[PDB]
Amino acid sequence: SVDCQVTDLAGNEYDLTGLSTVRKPWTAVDTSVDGRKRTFYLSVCNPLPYIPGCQGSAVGSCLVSEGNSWNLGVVQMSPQAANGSLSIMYVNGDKCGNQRFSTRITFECAQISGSPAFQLQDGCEYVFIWRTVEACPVV
Ligand SMILES: [Cl-]
Ligand code: NA
Numbered sequence: 770s771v772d773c774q775v776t777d778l779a780g781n782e783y784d785l786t787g788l789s790t791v792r793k794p795w796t797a798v799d800t801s802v803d804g805r806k807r808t809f810y811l812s813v814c815n816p817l818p819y820i821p822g823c824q825g826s827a828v829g830s831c832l833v834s835e836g837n838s839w840n841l842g843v844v845q846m847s848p849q850a851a852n853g854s855l856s857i858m859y860v861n862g863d864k865c866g867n868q869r870f871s872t873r874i875t876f877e878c879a880q881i882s883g884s885p886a887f888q889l890q891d892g893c894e895y896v897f898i899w900r901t902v903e904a905c906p907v908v
Contacts, residue, residue, distance in 0.1 A: 777850035
């Protein structure tokens with residue numbers, strides 16, 4: 770139940786409803802070495818559809834690896850424009866040390882239909898880069 774439409778301070782409209790997951794989630798491109806046995810599942814604004822092991826929390830980001838599943842953050846905030854670059858933040862996932870896992874997707878306006886890619890693990894935060902045409906200002 771999160772709005773996928775945001776207007777930045779400068780007045781640029783962003784519309785991410787085209788990335789919303791109605792039936793199946795997004796699958797993250799991961800060419801890391803730690804990505805051999807791990808799959809990241811992602812959704813924009815909407816919670817993930819049923820994925821075994823991360824049900825119950827309106828999970829927006831699920832790591833599935835070797836049978837086990839981890840909740841990497843729930844959908845609460847809308848995509849944040851805050852200079853013109855888009856970001857969405859899922860936090861308060863499964864326990865990660867003294868904190869909880871979180872997921873950040875950084876969007877970049879690119880004239881292509883892109884898929885989110887795993888970029889970085891910053892402690893308990895999983896960082897994703899999404900270069901795609903939907904990250905561009907709407908009319
Ligand atoms: Cl779909
Ligand atoms: Na289950």
